[model samples]
Target: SKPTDRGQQYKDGKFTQPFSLVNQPDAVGAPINAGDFAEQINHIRNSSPRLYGNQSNVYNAVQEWLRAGGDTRNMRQFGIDAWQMEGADNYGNVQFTGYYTPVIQARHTRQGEFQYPIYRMPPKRGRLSSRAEIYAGALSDKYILAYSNSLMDNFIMDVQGSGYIDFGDGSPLNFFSYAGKNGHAYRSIGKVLIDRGEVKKEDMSMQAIRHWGETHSEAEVRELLEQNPSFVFFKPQSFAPVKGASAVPLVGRASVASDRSIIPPGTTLLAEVPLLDNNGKFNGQYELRLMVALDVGGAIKGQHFAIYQGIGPEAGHRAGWYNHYGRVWVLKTAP
Candidate 1:
């Protein structure tokens, strides 16, 4: 459905048109039981920008829905509507991927097996060093926030941007958050491997890359890792919650990362994408869910989106191979 007046253009160079929820299956029938979405709803209420002129209505509607017993059937009464967003290509096609927080064993200080230290941002800030320079011990004098055993672990933690570190010494788990980066650009080693014919593009998942690291010689692995030039620095954070760029704790399965420049942060979204099997392979069956744009990523641009798959190994496994195609609908208050 097209808007009645001259519609607005999104920063991502997309045109938006008024969309009707009259016959929408999930939107009209039995409002989803939103009891489990309290955290996400709160985050949306607090963090969504006011520039779009609908945050208040969205928040108020959600609160009312919760007050009325959190029934999915009554959601339409809030006067919620949607906007169909289309890219420059004149297609509503969207590609979906997944990400997750990993749990790793860590130590407060470097010891016998925990030789690699996850460094905190130095007191003096600037482009400290490249990934190669850091790997060569440029930050040896800096403060160590935590320690890991393997180079792969350090690299994976950096790629994920944040994670949980369990000391396993009868202490509570710690959350390590993104502190800073070395100002260098991020290069995907998976792409590098594909270009070099080292791995097939279809099999270039994180799990496959880790497997490659294990099978390859240490020198080769180091060479592959250092090719990216970028290095991430992290610091210990309060175990409050894992937040995204929107400054709100992310909701597993409900939070997604997009290009904030293109898609407004804190906007509600609905996606119809493929389901992944236990082995991270597409299972042909499609799953539809409501999501919020609560985060952004350097690589997430144009029509791309990264779905948050929650925490731990299972989440990680699903994330490793969650590349699929789908449609995205941006929700707004109805006219």
Candidate 2:
């Protein structure tokens, strides 16, 4: 699959939708207020040029907004694109999901419980192998960055690509960012569980997988996890909430996972995020906000997008429950 052929869909969005900064009747929930909007704008300013390459008008438009101290009221000064991508039966909509960072308990050395090793990528290794082989002492010689307790939690860190490792005993939280992955394809074990009736297809979720992992024995969990040959590695960073592919720290309700080929990292977007009801069904109410395409997800492509919520169990709960259609307009420079 070469990146050569220009596609039909995005040749059309380029989620730039519209409403004035002044409270509009159509704007539901809370639009990203000026302070938070400005914060994201500055993040866009820091990485937009680097992410944009040739200094496209994307940067020019953001700089204009920066001049106004990220005032959303000044949005009309620049040209923002309103995108109504296909969402229905025929309603114009984009898919919006949620993602978060996990917090893992760990230690400096491997004890009885904290046995699963989070390793750094091997610099001089031949071919990095599958998760099964790697787990069974394949990289046992490799350096261990930190040792976390649950095999399930370790796998989660791999999935999230970044996490906070809590060393307890008053040790400050340290961030572990995505180092690299073994060049193997990823498959969902949750699907395997559904096929086996271990989990109902309707009940399938990351949370479901975690619950199964907890109840099952280590041997059972290992077998289940190894079904996906893919393995990820990490390197510790100082500390932060979560950083996107843009390398900028992410903000809840503002950062989104988008394929750079379509939306391009650092490009500003206006989102009408679909709100989920108490029962996890779409209530059809939207909370408008200014968001950035700061990261990518392996599953995210086409008009599909994932919103980065924040960190920890509460964030993960929100992310796991969100799966619905939303709207967006690409905010960029015109003419």
Candidate 3:
């Protein structure tokens, strides 16, 4: 594998580097499986005609690779060019995080112990209340799409921006989509804990935050959650795959959320980053594989990416602890 620094030229916030095929051949080929992204490819073709036209040759090459049963010979038929990205904060070294769809048990009505409600965006909206105010009953009169047993679960759902809710009584599952927000800036509660010396920065993870909530009293947890101020609203939809900002069903380990200014949506690229174990320790191997830039996030700015890690508890576990360094290469059709 060639290093990004060698033969790289940096000028005016752009880093031009040579493109090399990923060292891990097996991993490189895995994401190209047609079954994993057939729907995604179709979506790109059908929904994004302009984008499809922009990369028609490359898209057709990829489609051909998929149709030929993903043979290496077919893969060689595609042209691959590379470029290193540089943004205000990120030069060549990039930070990678992970996100996943959370599966939470919810109630359609606020009955029994399920008192906290996941609300819909208010119909008459003119500056909605803050997180604390909502908890205090700002949205009490509104229709409740689903209810959670604990505020932590609601917070997790808010952070993830979407979720799958199983009612558990033979009722249909609800897909909670991100409807709107309270317009306040998002404050990271993990950063809050670190600032107060309650938790070290390195130890801040979804698991760590959950552990803190479990040990603290409800009052303390509420205080912590309220510090964020921002509140997100949801709209329930029939059971379906969670869609990203790009309006496509996200594929686990293949979809990446990046700064659109730096890494435009629908861009195909490769990333080489550290692979972590279940305990969040580096397993000493780098994950060099293909990734598609298909989503964007407000917090995902220059040189930062959030890998979508599929749905359910297991995926959440991996996503929560994933914070590491990596390098990215944007692939283009060679002229």
Report the number of the highest-TM-score candidate: 3
Query: How far in Å is the alpha carbon of 197 misplaced in model 2?
Result: 6.2
Error of 3 at 31 (Å): 4.9
State the lDDT of candidate 3 residue by residue for 22-55, as single tens digits: 3222224423335545555566667667766776
Indicate whether candidate 1 or candidate 3 has the larger TM-score: 3
TM-score (C-alpha, index-matched) for candidate 3: 0.69
**What C-alpha lDDT values do all the predictions have?**
0.67, 0.67, 0.67
Off by over 4 Å in 1: 1-33, 46-53, 59-78, 84-93, 107-149, 159-163, 176-191, 199-220, 228-240
List CA RMSD, all candidates.
7.7, 8.2, 6.4
Runs with alpha carbons beyond 4 Å of true place in candidate 3 = 1-34, 63-77, 82-93, 108-115, 119-145, 158-163, 176-191, 198-219, 228-240, 286-288
Q: Which residue pairs in candidate 3 have backbone atoms (N, alpha carbon, C) closer than 3 angstroms, thus clashing?
A: none
* lDDT (10s digit) by residue, model 2, range 52-133: 4543466456556655654545555665333444532123356676777777888888887998888877754623678988
Please give each candidate's TM-score.
Answer: 0.67, 0.65, 0.69
Instruction: Give the lDDT of residue 40 in candidate 2.
Output: 67
lDDT score for candidate 1 against the true structure = 0.67
Q: Kindly list the per-residue Cα lDDT of model 1 for residues 1-91, writing each as its tens digit.
A: 4221111122233335323243232322222425435567766566554522456566566557557754445556676554544532334
